[PDB]
């Protein structure tokens, strides 16, 4: 019946001197969890092996080098494939991406669909790069993903997870209806990914109090307008002094949110999923072959 | 000048033999209502002249073209421009365009913008039409736009209007996100328009408790992600047996509802607007410039 | 660590013709998917035996009987509550009571707590009757409630249910503060219970569009009002030409809808309850011992 | 007459050597640019003539004392009601009162109504007083309100303002179903009052991200149960090293919000007031006398 149960991950904070390891038994735990309440794919945070990086500025490459994984799965995270293959339970996965290509040490904020085999079926790299690139000495943390990643690579694709179609996101991406249209013109029917959102934004503070409205609105209008499952885990909680955004959510193609966490901690939300249900939207108000006009939307690809 | 106030003159029912006299009385009221309260703009509804007669399956041509106007403004219409110029309120009007051409007639859903100096600066016709294009007999009411109305050939333009940049959306244009999109490329500061839209729909009557929900979510949605003012004007109640929604609204570039009517009859709302707001999100979290991959937005242009 | 899994199991329409049989059916299967995915009590809705037969005038008192349950559970309903002592899931069953006293035909739209043995811990009956007591021709379809009921006579009792401090209430009574905080004050931790609520409002049809919206806040300020998880099990669709709202959901003490069902169908939601959780609010910002100062209430308890 | 124009008078940060003088500056310039849109009330926030000095933990009474009025008004504050008389608008206005009685202190946080013709018609002494009652050493910021402060010996009364029944709250009060419901059953019209609400909860900092979720919720059910019209007005942004909450409305009988603040300084914001709007809910579903069962709730006045 095209059916499924799917499941969020949200983290708590993940401290600077908390190890790989730690970090694993606690994604083993939430997985191990899921699966108990059902769950056939669960999806984890973004960058969710580190505390997140990018808030401090490295004088120091092997200091930064350190919170990138150069092989997936190494033997510290091997238990986690292990174990999703055991219970059945595919997942997303985001870390910090470090490869040597042509003398240039490429890195990407990345993220991995595991299908229920325990078998990596499809990768995206983060397109969307939000911060800055320079330390910027009025901010009281900084966010130097553009310094610590280049755009990704990979375009935004659409892979066969356990005969779902499923679409990649990482944080700040969730904010551009573009990510979200390409993928749904690609016929994804859930779309995942992860987040690490501080509650206080240093350029725009007068916004601080909308952290978790435009977090949901930015899920919900995604998920309406493409007709399209979503679910968006966060790493929450005082991570190293910053305030990181909770809310993790699991969205139904009608944009209504169907589970959302409660808690600032690792926490596990579920919900019933029914591929069909895209339907609904997709082959009525947003059936796209017989209402888009795509000869007037050149502007949104012009460079 | 940056700052101004914005009204939205929401509609009641305009009933199938209701003259354009007794609408243009109806509209006067609203527009000399707003400027008594400071507005300098007032957004009406989409085909605010008529009763919604794409819900009708018509056999006669003559009585279709009935609905139509030949003429902008025509001697009936003209009043609405006269108020407009000597209270110092521009407005945006949606009403039926016909136009013949080497004597082929050409039918738009169109909407216009009028500036406090009640001339016409700008055009709109509707490009995302939506509805069935056959009659469906199970249907309590039709939705037949796509036969009664051509697709707009006028793309999203934005126009100058009395020192504020404003884009037009025609009902369903507001929930592509692509509509949005195109205008808030062009540097619209608000986009707006009207709407008819029952809280039945026949062929997805699942989601009827969510027309509202669905509604404020574009509206929410697309201001935000594009940093634009917006505001809708919807022509509510039960007209000719059918329910249409109200909830006009008018949105701040954070997505923030700042005002909302809550009657199904005429009514007008208004909002202080301050253009350079805009920019908490155009030179921040969304700098098209800074943050945009357009190089991987392409599927969204192709045809 | 005074932890749960409660589930909400959503009704879709049951026909006038539909048996007790056939409902129980129904149950059944929620009550084992519920179980399966790994929950612990499931609430059910108002009057889940039979149609919601208060839209009908009735002439003849055996027709109107028929509707009425004259023991709980009878041959039919045992199933139920053999299952949830098999699989350990309780449940609120809610239906129409008939029992004589005194010579009286008492009716009493009630509900019940049944623990994971099977058991019954506890009743209530509606105290807030709604709708009217009189045929009235300008309703397309009536709700008879104070005529075919009489005002619950239990109060509105806290019990003990599987080491969880449990409170009811039935449809209407969600909308009345004093049932919730009299629950609150006597320790509820979750208060749950069922409704039949029509998408259509004769008396006041301007309030269509706000159904889902009134009900949600209603169970929203609840919960958060009284640091109380809640859960609402609504029957949906269209039943006997009467639409149904759906949008089951279960809220955490803040206020926060953790699930909610997105079809009109028979369906199972689920979410993790701590019951410590209450505290945050309890102990806190709504610490009643505290900050309560109930000699300015009194009018409240006035007759 | 049942028809007129509310106005809430938000306030940006007032800092601790601001004079009353400046202050009266700032919420002139707010009613009178309310009176040009046409609005005949503005309601401005709690203690709107100084900074929250409760946010502070005392150790000079003089310098306690110079926080608090001990005339209203004096010869500095004089200037509002004699402009709210020449323009024909009244207003809430709240502020910390200081009475001698045979030379004892008694110290009120209260609000005053004052209509049309400059006149005080009524009075307030806010209830329930939140916080805590000793000095907090890890706290950024106290909140000692119950030291500073008796709670309110007026109860919740309704008073007859330019042919409007008004009520009045503050702040905290806005969270107390008690507190709506005795003004509700006095037959408020509108209920009104303003806040100082840190967006940061020392004790409680998991619902940090929620502080507008839970201001909103608990303005939007209060007002539709009571089917009164209400509005808030907050003193936001940063005072004095403290973050305050801004999101300033208005909101419908039937718990819409037909207005928002969007900025964190001084705002001005509107709305038409049908004063017989509340009948679609006061003479339906909320019609008291007729659904009430008060014999039920006497646990909620209980000492
Ligand atoms: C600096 S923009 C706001 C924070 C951003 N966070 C990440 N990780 O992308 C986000 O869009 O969620
Ligand atoms: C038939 S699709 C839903 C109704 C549609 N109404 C109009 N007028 O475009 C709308 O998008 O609002
Ligand atoms: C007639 S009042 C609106 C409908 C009512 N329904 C029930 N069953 O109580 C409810 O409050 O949900
Ligand atoms: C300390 S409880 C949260 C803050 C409180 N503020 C005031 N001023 O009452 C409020 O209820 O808004």
Chains 1, 2, 3, 4 share one sequence.
């Not at 016929?187 to 987040?195: M, N, R, T, V, W």
């Not at 934004?201 to 949901?216: A, Y």
């Not at 679910?231 to 193609?253: F, Q, R, T, W, Y």
Request: proline share 6%; aromatic share 10%.
């Amino acid at each position: 019946t095209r059916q499924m149960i799917l499941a969020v991950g949200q983290q708590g904070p993940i401290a600077r001197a908390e190890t790989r390891e730690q970090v694993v038994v606690r994604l083993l735990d939430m997985l191990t969890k899921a699966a108990s309440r059902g769950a056939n794919f669960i999806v984890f945070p973004e960058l969710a092996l580190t505390t997140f990086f990018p808030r401090w500025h490295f004088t120091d490459e092997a200091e930064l080098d350190s919170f990138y994984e150069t092989e997936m799965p190494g033997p510290v995270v091997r238990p986690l494939f292990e174990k999703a293959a055991e219970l059945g339970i595919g997942f997303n996965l985001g870390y910090a991406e470090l490869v040597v290509e042509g003398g240039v040490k490429r890195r990407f904020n990345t993220s991995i669909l595991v299908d229920k085999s325990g078998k990596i079926v499809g990768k995206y790299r983060k397109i969307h790069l939000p911060g800055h690139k320079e330390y910027e000495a009025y901010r009281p943390f900084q966010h130097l993903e553009k310094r610590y990643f280049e755009p990704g690579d990979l375009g935004f694709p659409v892979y066969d997870v356990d005969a779902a179609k499923m679409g990649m996101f990482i944080a700040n991406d969730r904010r551009w209806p573009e990510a979200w249209r390409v993928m749904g013109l690609r016929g994804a029917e859930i779309i995942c990914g992860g987040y690490n959102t501080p509650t206080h934004n240093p350029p725009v503070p007068q916004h601080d109090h909308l952290t978790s409205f435009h977090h949901l609105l930015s899920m919900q209008a995604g998920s309406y307008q493409n007709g399209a499952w979503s679910a968006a885990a966060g790493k929450a909680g005082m991570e190293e002094n910053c305030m990181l955004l909770g809310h993790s959510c699991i969205v139904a193609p009608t944009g209504e949110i169907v589970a959302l966490t409660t808690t600032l901690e690792d926490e596990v939300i579920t919900a019933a999923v029914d591929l069909d249900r895209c339907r609904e939207l997709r082959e009525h108000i947003f059936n796209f072959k017989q209402h888009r006009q795509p000869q007037h939307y050149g502007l949104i690809a012009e460079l």
